[PDB]
Amino acid sequence: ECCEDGWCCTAAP
Numbered sequence: 001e002c003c004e005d006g007w008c009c010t011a012a013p
């Protein structure tokens, strides 16, 4: 879910 949904991954620490 999310990062496999393609619209979630990023830096954001």
Ligand SMILES: *[C@@H]1O[C@H](CO)[C@H](O)[C@H](O[C@@H]2O[C@H](CO)[C@H](O)[C@H](O)[C@H]2O)[C@H]1NC(C)=O
Residues within 6 Å of the ligand: 009, 010, 011, 012
């Ligand atoms: C993932 O992290 C990076 C920031 O170090 C990249 O530039 C981008 O940054 C975030 O996304 C928006 C920046 O325009 C938000 O405003 C957020 O505050 C910011 O940290 C991120 N990548 C993506 C694709 O969103």
